[PDB]
C-alpha cells in the first residue's frame, strides 16, 4: 500500500489499550480515550505514540483531549485524516 503505519502491531485498538497496564497514576487521561485516538503507551513518563504517524505526545495538561492534541500537532497523520 501507499501508506504504512509506524507500528503495525498497535494497529489493533485492543493492543493499544493493553499497553497502558503501567500508565502512571498521575496521568489523567484514560487509556480508553488515548487508545481510541490511535495512541499507545511508550513506557516512559506520560509519553504516548501514534501507531499510524509515529508522533509522540507527552506532558499532558488539564483540558487536553487526545484527539484534539493528535490533530493539532500531527495534522497530516492518516489516522487523523481517516477518522
Amino acid at each position: 500500500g501507499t501508506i504504512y503505519p509506524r507500528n503495525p502491531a498497535m494497529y489493533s485498538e485492543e493492543a493499544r489499550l493493553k499497553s497502558f497496564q503501567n500508565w502512571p497514576d498521575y496521568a489523567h487521561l484514560t487509556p480508553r480515550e488515548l487508545a481510541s485516538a490511535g495512541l499507545y503507551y511508550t513506557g516512559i513518563g506520560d509519553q504516548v505514540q501514534c501507531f499510524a504517524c509515529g508522533g509522540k505526545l507527552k506532558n499532558w495538561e488539564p483540558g487536553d483531549r487526545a484527539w484534539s492534541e493528535h490533530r493539532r500537532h500531527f495534522p497530516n497523520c492518516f489516522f487523523v485524516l481517516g477518522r
Binding site: 508522533g55 509522540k56 505526545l57 507527552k58 506532558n59 499532558w60 487536553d64 492534541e69
Partner: peptide, 4 residues
Amino acid sequence: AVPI
C-alpha cells in the same frame, strides 16, 4: 501536550 508537547509533541515529539
